[PDB]
Homo-oligomer: A and B are copies of this chain.
Amino acid sequence: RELKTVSADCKKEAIEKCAQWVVRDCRPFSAVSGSGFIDMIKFFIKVGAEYGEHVNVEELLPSPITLSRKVTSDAKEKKALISREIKSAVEKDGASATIDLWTDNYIKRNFLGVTLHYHENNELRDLILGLKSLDFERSTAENIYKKLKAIFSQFNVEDLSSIKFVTDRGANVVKSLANNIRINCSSHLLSNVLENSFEETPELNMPILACKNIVKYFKKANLQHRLRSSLKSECPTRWNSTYTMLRSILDNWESVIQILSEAGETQRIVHINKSIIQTMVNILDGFERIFKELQTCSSPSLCFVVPSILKVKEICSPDVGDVADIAKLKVNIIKNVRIIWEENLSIWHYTAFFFYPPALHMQQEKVAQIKEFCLSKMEDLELINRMSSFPVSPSDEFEFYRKEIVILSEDFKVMEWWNLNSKKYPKLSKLALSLLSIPASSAASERTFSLAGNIITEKRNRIGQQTVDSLLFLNSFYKNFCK
């Protein structure tokens, strides 16, 4: 139990032996502090104890190919071992999935990611079910539903009606899921509402474009040597990338005009109203918190959809002191939130909010719709538990919860609040954590591609297909079910 310390003359060796590793193999410095690498060293001292200072390591150390082959063959067995743990939650209705399409930056292989989100008891699990290549196929909705089954066919799940899928509105994906539950991702919807509004307020394009022209100059001039904060670039594909660009200009406003002077290029700046640029980033900083708020797969998110919309409507509350071209922005913002974000929201968005204890907000026409909804799914989850064989009512429980009142402390979290409740409400609280497990964003599936991007690199480009599917799933598995 009591773990030994090594002499200060012993660690002085490790510190200069590890340094030999980094430089010769060109590895990062943070390799040593990586959790996987830490456990691997514990095993090599373990072999040195039983065997001793003289061992043949080249024969002991596997070649990378046998490592490529084990990662392949150890990934198959893991997908089987979890075959039961996955199939349990999916049939209990508590399964949430996130799918999107990607293509890698080198081989340009068309890819389909799928992540799964379910609740065990006290926590949530976000894991990579797979990343499969479509191998230069049409990428039609038909082929995606095809590959989506092939992923589920590895864990033996075949149904088409249990799972709840969240995805953006892309035509391929949206039709491929036409046969079952589909939730439009609130991150894409927000980026739609935002981006659509600036397009509809071109009066502000002159301040934005000049900024973009300022950013372009510092990059072309080999400038940005200083300011100790860089100027970010537009790149409209990135979410809320216009706020990151403006705040970078703004914080460095003092130094940028100084550099713009000596160049004689101060034409590029003087035409920008700073009063407006400020007012934009203040109004757009609230969105940035919402953008992060709705990317959370480590905690309930879908319940926060309807709350944030209100927060968007209030940050745009018209002020008489708002310079014109800003009020037009405030207008177009709230206008699109209705016809875009609100128009695409389903019953699962309000029912996730109904299960947040300070739910007194909408007691209007949304209450009866939740009633007809959560009444049917409570018996539908009761249909499952009766099949598991091997007086307080459903509707009495609907009004029962309606009277509960919880003042919101910073300690209050709806996550564990039902863990400390469910004993009283066995037949409802199960439906709640089923709803609170839905991410309401594609962010989970998005980060999968980021990880995918890390593994297939300029040097590692030769990696095909399943090797990536394996390496992603296992790194996910080892974060999920291992402490």
Residues of chain A touching chain B, judged by Cβ–Cβ distance below 8 Å, are 2-6, 10-11, 13-68, 70-71, 74, 108, 110, 135-136, 222, 225, 451, 454-455, 459-460, 470-471, 474-475, 478-479
Known contacts A10-B47, A27-B37, A45-B45; 18 further A-B pairs (Cβ under 8 A): A4-B55, A16-B70, A17-B39, A20-B40, A20-B478, A23-B470, A23-B475, A24-B34, A25-B35, A28-B459, A29-B64, A38-B61, A41-B44, A41-B57, A45-B52, A45-B57, A48-B48, A49-B53
CB pair A4–B68 under 8 Å, yes or no, is no
Which residue in chain B gives the minimum CB-CB distance to A72? B19
B3 touches A54 (CB 8 A): yes
CA distance A66 to B74 in the complex (A): 35
Q: Provide the bound-state CA to CA distance between A32 and B74, in Å.
A: 18
Q: State A31–B21 Cα separation when bound (angstroms).
A: 10
A39→B20 contact, CB < 8 A? yes
Beyond A17-B43, A52-B49, whether A225 also contacts B38 by CB under 8 A is: no
Q: B46 touching A16 by the CB < 8 A rule?
A: no
In contact, A5 and B59 (Cβ under 8 angstroms): yes
Number of copies: 2
Closest residue on chain B to residue A103 by CB atoms: B222
User: Nearest-CB distance from A14 to chain B (Å)?
Assistant: 6
10 A-B pairs in the complex with CB atoms less than 8 angstroms apart: A11-B60, A13-B43, A25-B35, A26-B455, A27-B37, A28-B459, A28-B460, A48-B48, A49-B52, A49-B53
The answer to whether A21 touches B3, judged by C-beta atoms less than 8 angstroms apart, is no
- Cα distance A23–B27 when bound, in Å? 15
Whether A222 pairs with B58 at a CB distance below 8 angstroms is: no
Distance, CA A475 to CA B355, complexed state (A): 59
Q: Are A31 and B25 in contact (CB under 8 A)?
A: yes
Question: How many Å from the CB of A318 to the closest CB on chain B?
Answer: 43
CB proximity of A480 to chain B, nearest CB, Å = 12
A11 contacts B57, C-beta separation under 8 Å:
no
Residue A40 contacts which of B21, B48, B52 (CB distance < 8 angstroms)? B21
Q: Is the CB of B58 within 8 A of A23?
A: no
Chain B residues with CB under 8 Å of A15's CB are 62, 66-67, 70
| C-alpha spacing A23/B471, complex, angstroms | 5
Choice from B61, B70, B136, B475 contacting A26 with Cβ under 8 Å: B475
Q: How far is the CB of A296 from chain B (nearest CB, A)?
A: 23
Bound state CA distance, A96 and B267, in angstroms? Answer: 50
Which of chain B's residues has its CB closest to A42's CB? B57
Q: Is the CB of B38 within 8 A of A74?
A: no
Q: How far is the CA of A49 from the CA of B6 in the complex (A)?
A: 12
- Bound: A451/B52 CA distance, A: 37
Q: How far is the CA of A59 from the CA of B66 in the complex (A)?
A: 31
Beta-carbon nearest neighbor of A70 in chain B: B19
A11, B45: Cβ atoms closer than 8 Å: no
CB-contact partner of A222 in B17, B34, B39, B108, under 8 A: B108
Docked complex Cα distance between A455 and B51 (Å): 36
Knowing A48-B45, A53-B45 are in contact, say whether A36-B62 is a contact too (CB < 8 A): no
Residues of B within 8 A of A135 (CB): 225
Measured between beta carbons, the chain B residues less than 8 angstroms from A30 are: 64
Chain B residues with CB below 8 A from A61, complex form: 14, 18, 32-33, 38, 41
Closest B residue to A44 by beta carbon equals B44
Closest Cβ–Cβ distance, residue A470 to chain B (whole Å) = 8
* Contact status A23-B474, CB under 8 Å: yes
Residues A21 and B37 in contact, CB atoms below 8 Å apart: yes
Among the listed B46, B55, B60, B74, which residue makes an inter-chain contact with A53, where contact means beta carbons less than 8 Å apart? B46
In angstroms, how far is the closest chain B Cβ from the Cβ of A405?
Answer: 45
Q: A31 contacts B36, CB within 8 Å?
A: no
Complex interface: chain B residues within 8 A of A22 (CB): 36, 67, 71, 471
CB-nearest residue of chain B to A27: B31
The smallest beta-carbon distance between A402 and chain B, in angstroms, is 47
A38: chain B residues within 8 A (beta carbon):
57-58, 61
A437 to B151, CA, bound (A): 59
Query: In the complex, A31 Cα to B32 Cα: how many Å?
Result: 13
Q: Which B residues are CB-close (under 8 A) to A41?
A: 44, 57, 61
| Interface pairs A-B: 7 shortest CB-CB | A24-B36, A48-B48, A45-B48, A29-B64, A25-B34, A23-B474, A136-B225
Question: Which chain B positions have C-beta within 8 A of A65?
Answer: 29
